[PDB]
Amino acid sequence: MTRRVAIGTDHPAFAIHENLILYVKEAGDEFVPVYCGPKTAESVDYPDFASRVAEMVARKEVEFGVLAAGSGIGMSIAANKVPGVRAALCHDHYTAAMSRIHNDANIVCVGERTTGVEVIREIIITFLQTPFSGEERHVRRIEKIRAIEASHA
Amino acid sequence: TRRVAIGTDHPAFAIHENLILYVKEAGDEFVPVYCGPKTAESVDYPDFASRVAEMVARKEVEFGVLAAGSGIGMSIAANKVPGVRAALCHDHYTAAMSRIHNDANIVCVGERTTGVEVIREIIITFLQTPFSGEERHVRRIEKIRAIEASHA
Amino acid sequence: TRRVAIGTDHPAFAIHENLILYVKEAGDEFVPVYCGPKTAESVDYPDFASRVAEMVARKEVEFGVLAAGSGIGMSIAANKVPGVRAALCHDHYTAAMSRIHNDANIVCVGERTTGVEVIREIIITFLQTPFSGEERHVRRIEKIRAIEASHA
Amino acid sequence: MTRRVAIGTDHPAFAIHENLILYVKEAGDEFVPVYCGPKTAESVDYPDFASRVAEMVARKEVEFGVLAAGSGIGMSIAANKVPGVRAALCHDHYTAAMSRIHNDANIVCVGERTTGVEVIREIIITFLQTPFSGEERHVRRIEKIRAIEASHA
């Protein structure tokens, strides 16, 4: 009945991982943060934690992923390489909402070096709270994304 | 000659001629190859993403540009193609860093989120900015390829 | 009835009917009063900023909306009018916080920087979000009035 | 021959004031940061430091101002109430450049809670390095801003 939300970061975004845990809780009591990012401030490679969270989402161990890094760009590239993952790099409320409404995104990506924590807060909450629309055209398009995955499997 | 395949969906069709011009503005060496819809009628972004992304994957063009409503769908779909690194950019900084850190080969923009002058800036910056070639970045990009390999 | 004066310059003239509609979308109580140019020919933003800002200052309308290329000129000029608090917004968060913290009475947007769907979001959020009325915010807003007074 | 750049913040942006000093220097050796923000992390009111920096710019004690706060919105409202000041709230490279090119802005405002430090870095550098265009229409429009000031003096 509650909804698990896996969280990953690289090194620069480690400073805000408690923030991320908190922002997930702020979305609602039904959202459970599962912190899977570095345990310390040590330099890491983003694809390893993108992969870690992405696989959890793909295997359905969690419903949602949060990936925070310098820019979030590498996070969104790495995570989308995992089949079943729809990872959206968001920079504001609008992209966060539309990633859910149009793309039924299951991973939100943000940049610690690009986006202020209060906007990251807003992004995480909006992403978790905004439902997928279910509308015919979006379903068809998401299915075409799945078709692209299959053709390369 | 550095060829740049351009794809859009319906809302971004209205600015396709802008994208063609912005690519050229990046320098004489940059050659736009328009692969988007030829009318304003509604299409599905993954069809145009795939088309551009396959061209990049297969080395038929060096770069792609995908423009849609938000660009989010474009970046999800394009990245499903092995060898693609598609970066959804919303400013100069992300456009630059996508090349510097990630050696992105596709740039994604939202026509409904980002004004055309910033889209212009994004495209020019993306094409002009070189990959750093720095050690850690090369290692991380290979790690992306190792994720692809693990699912192929 | 909560009246909202709308002003633009030339690049934002193309979306003036959008702004009129976005104001209405904020709720039935919101009434757009268009005070921008009536043709696409080039104008000077401070003329339209002043016009809208004077209406807000004089209490003839509750709110203003200024749309230009970047909105930066709009926000500089509008703020030169005593009683105006003009907020240049580029997303939902700034639009909300301009009302919550600053009790902004004019919202400024760039047609060349910010896509129309985000402009739509900015306008709706700006108009719908109430000022917090919190103590520190009231004190700081009065401090803004004391800066005006010190130069009048 | 060098160019003084006054820096102010409120409380939340105090954490990054050394960043701001550094970013001004990064624009070039000709740019001299003059830190005028809070000396400590104590809660302050943004208009007081906006005023402080704005007056310095208006009196021409410095050429440029940097104001960093939560959102930067209040900073840009307060600073523009000082005659002679053209304070631009910027959130990216484009607005930073155009504030100089079109508006000959003399104060840049940023939000610590909205904009990541690396974008703030880019904003400050672009603002300081980008020249005013001098073009006829911008001069006329800036003069109309001055005219608005006069009519309320």
Side-chain angles (χ1 to χ4, degrees), chain A residues 9-12 38 42-52 69 74-75 78, chain B residues 135-144 147:
Chain A
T9 76
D10 66 349
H11 37 121
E42 57 167 65
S43 191
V44 289
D45 295 342
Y46 65 87
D48 296 329
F49 288 93
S51 179
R52 198 191 191 174
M75 289 299 193
Chain B
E135 192 187 337
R136 67 198 193 280
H137 304 136
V138 178
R139 182 183 65 246
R140 291 154 184 176
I141 289 157
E142 167 71 19
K143 288 191 183 185
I144 294 175
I147 298 167

Side-chain angles (χ1 to χ4, degrees), chain B residues 3-27:
Chain B
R3 296 170 169 84
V4 179
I6 304 175
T8 77
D9 67 352
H10 44 288
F13 172 81
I15 66 157
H16 81 282
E17 284 175 342
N18 296 239
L19 307 168
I20 289 164
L21 169 64
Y22 304 157
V23 162
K24 292 166 168 173
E25 289 197 58

Side-chain angles (χ1 to χ4, degrees), chain D residues 21-145:
Chain D
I21 292 164
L22 180 61
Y23 305 151
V24 171
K25 291 175 173 156
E26 293 196 61
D29 294 356
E30 77 261 51
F31 298 99
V32 188
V34 183
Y35 183 69
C36 295
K39 300 201 184 206
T40 49
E42 57 167 65
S43 191
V44 289
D45 295 342
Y46 65 87
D48 296 329
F49 288 93
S51 179
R52 198 191 191 174
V53 168
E55 295 288 346
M56 293 172 70
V57 168
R59 291 189 176 273
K60 304 164 190 292
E61 287 174 35
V62 300
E63 181 182 5
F64 292 115
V66 174
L67 293 170
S71 61
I73 292 162
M75 289 299 193
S76 73
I77 300 166
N80 280 313
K81 298 310 181 170
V82 178
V85 167
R86 296 182 295 285
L89 176 58
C90 302
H91 63 277
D92 74 335
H93 176 274
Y94 183 86
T95 49
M98 294 308 306
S99 73
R100 302 286 305 114
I101 301 172
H102 279 48
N103 311 290
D104 190 20
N106 47 31
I107 297 182
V108 62
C109 304
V110 297
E112 189 271 342
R113 299 295 174 172
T114 63
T115 303
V117 300
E118 291 305 312
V119 177
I120 288 171
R121 183 181 173 276
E122 187 185 63
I123 289 167
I124 287 166
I125 290 159
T126 308
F127 188 83
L128 293 172
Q129 291 181 353
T130 309
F132 171 52
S133 76
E135 285 174 42
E136 179 171 52
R137 68 196 192 277
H138 311 138
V139 171
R140 181 183 65 249
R141 287 154 189 168
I142 289 152
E143 178 47 41
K144 293 189 176 173
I145 300 176

Side-chain angles (χ1 to χ4, degrees), chain A residues 86-137:
Chain A
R86 296 182 295 285
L89 176 58
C90 302
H91 63 277
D92 74 335
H93 176 274
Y94 183 86
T95 49
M98 294 308 306
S99 73
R100 302 286 305 114
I101 301 172
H102 279 48
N103 311 290
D104 190 20
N106 47 31
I107 297 182
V108 62
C109 304
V110 297
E112 189 271 342
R113 299 295 174 172
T114 63
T115 303
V117 300
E118 291 305 312
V119 177
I120 288 171
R121 183 181 173 276
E122 187 185 63
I123 289 167
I124 287 166
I125 290 159
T126 308
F127 188 83
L128 293 172
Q129 291 181 353
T130 309
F132 171 52
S133 76
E135 285 174 42
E136 179 171 52
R137 68 196 192 277

Side-chain angles (χ1 to χ4, degrees), chain B residues 120-132:
Chain B
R120 182 186 171 271
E121 201 175 63
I122 289 155
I123 285 153
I124 299 178
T125 311
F126 187 78
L127 297 174
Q128 286 181 347
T129 313
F131 175 49
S132 72

